[PDB]
Design a protein around this ligand. Structure first.
Ligand SMILES: O[C@H]1[C@H](O)[C@@H](O)CN2CC[C@H](O)[C@H]12
Ligand SMILES: [Ca+2]
Length: 556
């Protein structure tokens, strides 16, 4: 046969709100993105995943949708969206949109209607329950602070919201609701979108009766929220009624679920979703409370990647990324963002990202080596999630405001949301006004204009890597083997296909290291290296590595 285009594609994630402002209000928009398509095409991007672009009050920057058929006012008009679509097609590029249907905004007409009385036809489009013992219906906590149940004086009942209080969860147990969601998907699919990514797909099915979580379940409530008994039945129904009739690739953001459950969502035979977005790797060093970090090593990094790759089996398929809108900057998180190591570790991480088995997603700015932001106060964070931590940990006295600041500065989602650094003009050329979130001061040295014409820049390294992955089948769809899962200094692995085998070797330490190839394996050619003064000699049986050196080789 032949593998789907998405298996060998290189994606780029665009967080519109922080990509390019074209009208000075401080917020990125569609015209800004459209304006930059040549830039992304020049980088080598085959497809783009854009975060929510629908009408929204923005309590959660797009993830709280008030109208699924209207574009977000801040991003432009439907006309602008259409133009973006057309310009993408002109360049033979594809678009993947985010689909948020676990919950809607509390400003969506379905909710306004639903909440008005106990007897309207939209009551069951959401979850309404009586409280118990003078308290909420049960002990369900919300990811964004306090209880997941909010009382509404109009009826005396509580509505469910796993996330924000203004993000009431939709009721998938109601057939009419499901049908409205399907009609909604076709609306966008009919416009030609090539892919759909489903925000927290594993939480659609709620547990019948809403019994309290046990003390143990309470310790990782996210997991219990992915245990609805009708989850896969709904996902299968959605595929049968919708995707079965289209040519779009589907991807699921499997948030909170144990890795062993992943295959149920992506095994092509099950006819649910095509690709998986998991959190195991990107949160491999994150505490349960989500704002503390736990020390880990390369050994933990690779072993996690090893498990994730393994559950894709023969019929499944994974996405791979080191960054996104919900996590700290890749170079800061996995590399070394100190002035003297930022570029070297950034290039090394790029080598990892583009040689992994699965479909790579490059988050905007990582091609430049962008870092975390130097937050000084809790007020420097815009994120609703941080407010949630304050409510749950500072007001309850479990931690001081300074403790929260110290720790969340390294885990916050806002680290990834500061304006993309185009050049060194005001606000790194992101806007002519005041950015919605402060630009990182390091924009004077880290910016696209400065790296674009520099063949030694992190940008060029990514471009060269993308070019190379595109020309080497084994690097996309080939098998994967970790040479030594327990090694905490150097990450080395092979990718193979149709007799050809490649070797990737990446030094994660800021010191010289050595690597001996597996018995009987020899360097045949060097495809590329970063931070290396000399390529190995043909036939080499070992490698000498500089601090943070990376390389892709064809072996024999
Ligand atoms: O970005 C968030 C968003 O705030 C919510 O709609 C929930 N989603 C699931 C968790 C994932 O990170 C994503
Ligand atoms: Ca704007």
């Amino acid at each position: 046969p032949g593998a789907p285009w998405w298996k060998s594609a290189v994606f780029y994630q665009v967080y519109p709100r922080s990509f390019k402002d074209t009208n000075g209000d401080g917020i990125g928009d569609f015209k800004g993105l459209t304006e930059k398509l040549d830039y992304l095409k020049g980088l080598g991007i085959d497809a783009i995943w854009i975060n929510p672009h629908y009408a929204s009050p923005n309590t959660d920057n797009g993830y709280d949708i008030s109208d699924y058929r209207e574009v977000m006012k801040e991003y432009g008009t439907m006309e602008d969206f259409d133009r973006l679509m057309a310009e993408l097609k002109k360049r033979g590029m594809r678009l993947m949109v985010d689909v948020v249907i676990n919950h809607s905004s509390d400003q969506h007409e379905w909710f306004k209607s639903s909440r008005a009385s106990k007897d309207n036809p939209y009551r069951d489009y959401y979850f309404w329950r009586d409280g118990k013992d003078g308290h909420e219906p049960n002990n369900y906590p919300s990811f964004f602070g306090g209880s997941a149940w909010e009382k509404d004086p109009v009826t005396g009942q509580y509505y469910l919201h796993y996330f924000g209080r203004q993000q009431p969860d939709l009721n998938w147990d109601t057939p009419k609701l499901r049908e409205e969601l399907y009609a909604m998907l076709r609306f966008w699919l009919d416009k030609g979108v090539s892919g759909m990514r489903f925000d927290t797909v594993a939480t659609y099915s709620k547990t019948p009766g809403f019994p309290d979580l046990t003390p143990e379940q309470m310790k990782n409530f996210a997991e219990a929220y992915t245990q609805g008994p009708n989850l896969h039945r709904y996902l299968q129904e959605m595929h049968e009624k919708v995707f079965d009739h289209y040519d779009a690739v589907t991807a699921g953001e499997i948030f909170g679920a144990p890795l062993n459950q992943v295959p149920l969502f992506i095994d092509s035979r099950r006819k649910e979703l095509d690709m998986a977005f998991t959190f195991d790797l990107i949160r491999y060093d994150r505490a349960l409370d989500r704002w503390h970090t736990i020390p880990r090593t390369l050994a933990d990094f690779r072993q996690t990647i090893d498990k994730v790759d393994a559950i894709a089996g023969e019929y499944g398929w994974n996405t791979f990324f080191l960054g996104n809108h919900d996590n700290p900057r890749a170079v800061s998180h996995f590399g070394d963002d100190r002035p003297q190591w930022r570029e070297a570790s950034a290039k090394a991480l790029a080598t990892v990202t583009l040689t992994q088995r699965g479909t790579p997603f490059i988050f905007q700015g990582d091609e430049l080596g962008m870092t975390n932001y130097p937050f000084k106060t809790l007020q420097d964070f815009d994120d609703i999630e941080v407010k949630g931590f304050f409510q749950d940990y500072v007001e309850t006295g479990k931690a001081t405001a300074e403790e929260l600041l110290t720790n969340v500065a390294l885990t916050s989602r806002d680290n990834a949301r500061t304006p993309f650094q185009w050049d060194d003009s005001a606000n790194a050329g992101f806007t002519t006004g005041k950015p919605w979130l402060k630009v990182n001061p390091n924009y004077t040295e880290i910016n696209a204009a400065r790296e674009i014409g520099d063949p030694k820049s992190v940008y060029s390294f990514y471009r060269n890597l993308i070019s190379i992955r595109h020309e080497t089948p084994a690097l996309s769809t080939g098998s994967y083997r970790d040479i030594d899962p327990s090694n905490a200094d150097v990450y080395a692995y092979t990718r193979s296909q149709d007799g050809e085998t490649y070797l990737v070797v990446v030094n994660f330490k800021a010191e010289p290291r050595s690597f001996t190839l597996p018995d009987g394996m020899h360097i045949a050619e060097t495809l590329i290296e970063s931070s290396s003064p000399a390529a190995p000699a043909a036939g080499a049986a070992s490698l000498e590595l500089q601090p943070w050196q990376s390389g892709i080789y064809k072996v024999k």
